[PDB]
Amino acid sequence: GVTSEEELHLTRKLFWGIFDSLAHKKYDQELYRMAMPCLCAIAGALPPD
Amino acid sequence: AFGFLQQLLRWMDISQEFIAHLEAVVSSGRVEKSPHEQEIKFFAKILLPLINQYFTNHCLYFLSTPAKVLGSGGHASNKEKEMITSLFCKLAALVRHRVSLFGTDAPAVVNCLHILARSLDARTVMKSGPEIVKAGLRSFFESASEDIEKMVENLRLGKVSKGVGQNLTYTTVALLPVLTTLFQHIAQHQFGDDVILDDVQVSCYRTLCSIYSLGTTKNTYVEKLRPALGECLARLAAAMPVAFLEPQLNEYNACSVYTTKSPRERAILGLPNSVEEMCPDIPVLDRLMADIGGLAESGARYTEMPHVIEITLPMLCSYLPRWWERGPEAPPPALPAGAPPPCTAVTSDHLNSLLGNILRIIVNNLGIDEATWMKRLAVFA
């Protein structure tokens, strides 16, 4: 099947929720090591348009 | 993508803020407080891997156009194409002469530049785009030409080889690989006739002028830099819309500064008043072919002609195929557009003659102990 236009909305909020929070969190190597792959995977799933 | 790119551009001005602080402290007033330590780590450890992977997956989306769709579906808008162009220009200017300041993050920066270059739809940006965005792309080529000119004049042993060290390590690690990738991207998508038009041509001419000027130079640094310089020059020849090796037929080329611009102009900006004088130290195609043929038949080894094999041959191996399709003997759909005579004289004879000379060059060095240029020559031919 295909996404239902609601999972994409959840995915879009999930991306920016992590991105905004990580942009203010103090640098933690363990946190950054596994948050970055999550952002790449989420960004690679959302359609650009 | 519009929101994601806008945030990336928002961090670009932030990136410019602390690198200047790093440049300031590394010059005077040493302090290890690093007020932007969070910003530096987030930019280097999150943004660069994110830019690296995002545009690798969605490369076709930004290169697509409503006329020709390349990806599965959808195409980037003009504003998105403008933003990704400004992202490349800002990132390139960020690392310019600051490769050392990034430490181990410099390989990440150049990898992002490679991927951003492969996703630049420069045809639409240069044709229908804002002046600010277009001026950024023009400034990149102009800055690249100036850096290469400083590099080649230092390889001329003007300095022993301050800023000489910074310029040399920036060009050989960042500028040359990125410029090679950008020219290759332009050549594959036939963007040369739309991007390198008025001032990019002048910038590309100076790059073409300077790189070939290493033939009369014999040093240790030049020896190891020939494969990088030769590959960059070969890609430039594929993307150059002017037949710089055949100036006698330049009057029939529409994509030339001497035809697009009036004689009243081209004087406010310094031009040599003649197409033949743009890069006068480059031999014409007829002369260049004769020199290679003479070397091939003379049985000369690689040691007595390193410039021809490493630089001149890759240039011709890319110049001739481009202009064979735009000159005589091409399969011309030119019933309506056949009035302008071809601006080049490249036929199948030139390609056949060059290939025969290349084969004779290889067999002259067939039994030598060490020759690492053979693999590079094979892929170019």
Curated annotation (Swiss-Prot), chain A:
Detected in skeletal muscle (at protein level). Fast- or slow-twitch skeletal muscle. It is found in: Sarcoplasmic reticulum membrane. It comes from the Eukaryota. The N-terminus is blocked. Belongs to the ryanodine receptor (TC 1.A.3.1) family. RYR1 subfamily. Homotetramer. Can also form heterotetramers with RYR2. Identified in a complex composed of RYR1, PDE4D, PKA, FKBP1A and protein phosphatase 1 (PP1). Repeated very high-level exercise decreases interaction with PDE4D and protein phosphatase 1 (PP1). Interacts with CALM; CALM with bound calcium inhibits the RYR1 channel activity. Interacts with S100A1. Interacts with FKBP1A; this stabilizes the closed conformation of the channel. Interacts with CACNA1S; interaction with CACNA1S is important for activation of the RYR1 channel. Interacts with CACNB1. Binding of [3H]ryanodine indicates that the heterozygous channel is activated by Ca(2+) concentrations 4-fold lower than normal. Single-cell analysis of cotransfected cells shows a significantly increased resting cytoplasmic Ca(2+) level and a significantly reduced luminal Ca(2+) level. The calcium release channel activity resides in the C-terminal region while the remaining part of the protein constitutes the 'foot' structure spanning the junctional gap between the sarcoplasmic reticulum (SR) and the T-tubule. Pore opening is mediated via the cytoplasmic calcium-binding domains that mediate a small rotation of the channel-forming transmembrane regions that then leads to channel opening. This is Ryanodine receptor 1. It comes from Oryctolagus cuniculus (Rabbit). The chain holds residues 2665 to 2713 of 5037 of the full protein.
Swiss-Prot record, chain B:
Belongs to the ryanodine receptor (TC 1.A.3.1) family. RYR1 subfamily. The chain holds residues 2956 to 3342 of 5037 of the full protein. Binding of [3H]ryanodine indicates that the heterozygous channel is activated by Ca(2+) concentrations 4-fold lower than normal. Single-cell analysis of cotransfected cells shows a significantly increased resting cytoplasmic Ca(2+) level and a significantly reduced luminal Ca(2+) level. Signal peptide: none annotated. The N-terminus is blocked. Channel activity is modulated by phosphorylation. Detected in skeletal muscle (at protein level). Fast- or slow-twitch skeletal muscle. The calcium release channel activity resides in the C-terminal region while the remaining part of the protein constitutes the 'foot' structure spanning the junctional gap between the sarcoplasmic reticulum (SR) and the T-tubule. Pore opening is mediated via the cytoplasmic calcium-binding domains that mediate a small rotation of the channel-forming transmembrane regions that then leads to channel opening. Disulfide bonds: none annotated. This is Ryanodine receptor 1. It comes from the Eukaryota. Homotetramer. Can also form heterotetramers with RYR2. Identified in a complex composed of RYR1, PDE4D, PKA, FKBP1A and protein phosphatase 1 (PP1). Repeated very high-level exercise decreases interaction with PDE4D and protein phosphatase 1 (PP1). Interacts with CALM; CALM with bound calcium inhibits the RYR1 channel activity. Interacts with S100A1. Interacts with FKBP1A; this stabilizes the closed conformation of the channel. Interacts with CACNA1S; interaction with CACNA1S is important for activation of the RYR1 channel. Interacts with CACNB1. Cytosolic calcium-activated calcium channel that mediates the release of Ca(2+) from the sarcoplasmic reticulum into the cytosol and thereby plays a key role in triggering muscle contraction following depolarization of T-tubules. Repeated very high-level exercise increases the open probability of the channel and leads to Ca(2+) leaking into the cytoplasm. Can also mediate the release of Ca(2+) from intracellular stores in neurons, and may thereby promote prolonged Ca(2+) signaling in the brain. Required for normal embryonic development of muscle fibers and skeletal muscle. It is found in: Sarcoplasmic reticulum membrane. It comes from Oryctolagus cuniculus (Rabbit).
